[PDB]
């Protein structure tokens, strides 16, 4: 029923501004309070402010003035939030939230990930990782696919076009001077490799890239 | 303006046993609110006004407390409960959250599996050389990595990324990657990644040679 | 006609702690009944009509529940309580039992002791040759055996028998026996029985040679 | 007080029939319901039926008709159960049970173990198990006594005519094509063997066998 | 004249969980009294008349029971609670105490560190020779020592002293010292102290030679 | 508030007598019952008796007559206890105790440790413990200071005059034929020893001894 849809990700340079929105349905928008919450990696949830469209009431967190300016469009339909300053401090996940009066929240939005960086959009690389020269110890062989130097997130990594998914560990990317680095491991038996073909497939929507790299034995 | 401290920070509980999580406030508080957030999903309201449950909340969650000390109790721990839990307050505007009690699922001690990979020829073409060491399937999360080049330890240029707890076997996995230049890589021969886990004092050692 | 599932199947509890056992019914049930069966003895009635206790039942057992979900609770676990517990229903004639919750007593991790025995000359007279490998005193029950003849694994002709948990030290013991013919026994020399236990990843290996 | 005595074991070939009985005392037999329960190794307890001798009421499990025919003798004293079909499926422990009305049981009988097999009654063998040629590792020596190829159960295995019982693990027998195989282990110190005599004693009542085998050093 | 038995003798509990301690009387008793004694300090009254708490007693301690069976319950175990607890009775003059339930704090398995020391030249001057073997930081308390001179075991003249559980890391430490004469020390060469702990079946071995 | 002060330790030969006292303050002495308790190493707490100064009531444990004679001085201020017999059995910690009527105790005294021994007061020795000839395994070096043959207790052992306290394990003394033996261990890194000076300091008040022993490398 109650759904609070908001766009995926926004990527804006330091200094400039962002206008976040929240498409609300499943309930009467003009009846219940709309709150905004900021979540950072390892610092916890931080409440920003809240608007009541009734009765126009706009509350703010004293630490968030005047970085955030909250407005509401009522037609159409959404709740707006403009971030004015934009610094490396602002890089976080911003959540839409419905609530009945102050000050708790019932339903949360999908969340928009905001990345404040001076870096430019760049294409990935993709590298094949092969085991040691000779043989692998045991019966289970381990293969990898290293993706180094790409901006921004995300990257969809699939093995064998989607035919291989069991025993696959995809590791989250880390920021390394403007460009991300991601790795993924796969564990299969020695009877399948290198007897059958194994290929890691990486696609980046922001750069329109499609790389299929075959792991050849050393 | 009240500071809320949730204790403990990381919870470890086995399925089918009582779970008590606590939040502590700086000063007197009238009503408390709790929030559940599963990995890769939006948070949701569990408990409102200290004790009342939200709609859609399974019958196993409970809340109580007063003033400064408040508690969320799970009568019987289930697999779909492994999530981060957050404190929430008002009557003091803000309107602040707690640190976040991370409820992790308990598993019988697991030993890490190590696979070391030499830098690819495609990267060595560009001038860079990244040695990747995969640490797969281990319990618990806490582990130590030690890169040794020809015996000597290296600390700068090391990248370490952990995964969230698996839904099937409940084990952790991390990726250790040391980045070096083509000049720095070819000056030395032996490259080793050591895994120091709680399961065994003896480090799990996987290494290779450059000239071979 | 109602199917009763008892959960979990195997229980592990230390003496002096709360024990909660659960039975679940397919549909609504009015009254529940519980039964205790100690190894090598006839079963007996513990709880009748969901909550009332039978005569002779020690004051520590308790029952509750309604409709589909019912529970047997032991407030404090004692040594003489290590038994299999069964669900029981009516108002649906049959009149069926549950799977059986096996309450096993908890013990501090034990390592298996292995003793391999060559086939006796009395059996070799008949034309048969049975190599017996005894696995004594280990915790818990779950263990893996691997027969290796000259290095190669053998799977057919293997006999494995477990004992019930001991009353004194609370450990399990199993007997592994591979049966071969006189021709099959004399063709090879080396005979090995490997024990793969949870206590250590390294297999406990005891072997001998035929020619010696 | 209340005792429900029933014979030890019955061994009947496939096709033929068995008449099970239950000698009841300690209470008024004609007052309380008599139930019958079948228990298999790893399949759980299965209820068969129940008779009230009053008021003659005979209930049956629909899955057990007409394999079981229940009758009651009231003089003398017992409750009868005839199994008509007899297959390898029937091989189980059959329990007598008292109860006050339908449908739960207060006191259970001793239980009669029924074995449906085409196999014939056979004498045991008994073999001495000696450790490796030379010496045993540590201070505690381990000895065994293997009994192979016997029918039916049970076999009474005692060490040193009953003088040795501490540290003895007797392992339950398993069915191996008509004839059972049983083993037992004993752990004693090196100061007792082979300085003192150790003998495993096996007796089979169905074949009138008495074997005393001495473990000689290899 | 009543004999009071406290059970169990040694308690092991982790911080933040329910703790139930029990005392049992020979015959009927009207009121019970409990006493806390921390290491290196005077005992104090916790509970009086079975249930009432003494002044200054933190809100976590509770008492109940009747006749012969009585209990002290700690709802949530804290670090400052690691102490010995004693039973106390009257209406039978004496007026006797229990054995003493020692509440020890729980810690994740610790491996002992061994350092062997040869007799000092100052003692060898006097004519005595004491070989000191220090066993530091291990959990739990129970450990076995084995002095081996040239391979042969020595039992007489051995001194073993344990420390109380540490306040910081919660580990035990013991000092093993074998006393010998100058004649007995110089007759042999090799001296070994072996540590047999629950953590590993393999003994932790530290040794030295006299001639070196 | 309520404080029950009593002397540290008393050391008296077998046969002779001891007069224990308990200076009471913080409450009206003549109002509340005074109890006496004996505590031994591994045998538990043993109640001796109790006096009410009011109303002079003196109760005794039947097992403690007439080893203990209890009297009270009321001016000044204290509660007295004379032990008459004195044997090796008597060696224990004796506790003062306040209570409101029979028979439980509110506040306990500091406790006086009584040692019944025919041994004479003797000076300590102090010996330096150095690691094996060559090097120590790892990065952390372990040093010790052995104090052998001293009477009576206690001995104050400090490292580097009080500059070293972290990672120090001082082990309780044991009775070895009239004279005690105490040891202490210290764990420090290899960069501090033998580059910097480490000294164990032992002082015995009963013999007026002050020993500073430097651990020299072997």
Numbering used by the authors:
A (entry chain H): 3001 to 3218
B (entry chain G): 3001 to 3212
C (entry chain E): 2001 to 2212
D (entry chain F): 2001 to 2218
E (entry chain C): 1001 to 1212
F (entry chain D): 1001 to 1218
Question: What are the paper's exact sentences on this?
Answer:
Chikungunya virus (CHIKV) is a mosquito-transmitted viral pathogen that causes fever, myalgia, rash, and severe arthritis in humans. The E1 glycoprotein participates in cell fusion, whereas the E2 glycoprotein binds to cellular receptors and initiates clathrin-dependent endocytosis. Most neutralizing antibodies bind to E2, as this glycoprotein is more exposed on the viral surface than E1. We also describe pseudo-atomic resolution structures of CHIK VLPs complexed with Fab fragments from four different neutralizing mouse monoclonal antibodies (MAb CHK-9, CHK-152, m10 and m242).
Four cryoEM structures were determined to ∼15 Å resolution of CHIK VLPs complexed with the Fab fragments of the neutralizing mouse MAbs CHK-9, CHK-152, m242 and m10. All Fab fragments bound the VLPs with one Fab fragment per E2 molecule. The crystal structures of CHK-9 and m242 Fab fragments were determined to 3.0 Å and 3.1 Å resolution, respectively. These Fab structures were fitted into the cryoEM maps of the corresponding VLP-Fab complexes. The coordinates of the E2 B domain in the VLPs did not agree well with the B domain density in the maps of the VLP complexed with the CHK-9 or m242 Fab fragments, suggesting that the E2 B domain had a different orientation in these Fab-bound structures than in the non-complexed VLPs. The footprint of CHK-9 and m242 Fabs onto the VLP localized primarily onto the domain A and did not include any part of domain B. Indeed, binding of these fragments to the VLPs had nudged domain B ∼10 Å sideways, out of the way of the Fab fragment. All four MAbs examined here bind to the end of the trimeric spikes that includes the putative receptor attachment region, although only the CHK-9 Fab footprint actually overlaps the site. Nevertheless the proximity of these footprints to the possible receptor-binding site could probably allow neutralization by competitively limiting access of the virus to the cell surface receptor. However, to block receptor attachment it is necessary to block all three receptor-binding sites on every spike. Such a stoichiometry would require substantially higher concentrations of Fabs to inhibit infectivity, as seen with CHK-9, m10 and m242 Fabs. In summary our structural studies suggest that the CHK-9, m10, and m242 Fab fragments neutralize CHIKV infectivity by blocking the cellular binding site on the A domain of E2 and that the CHK152 inhibits fusion by stabilizing domain B of E2, preventing exposure of the fusion loop on E1.
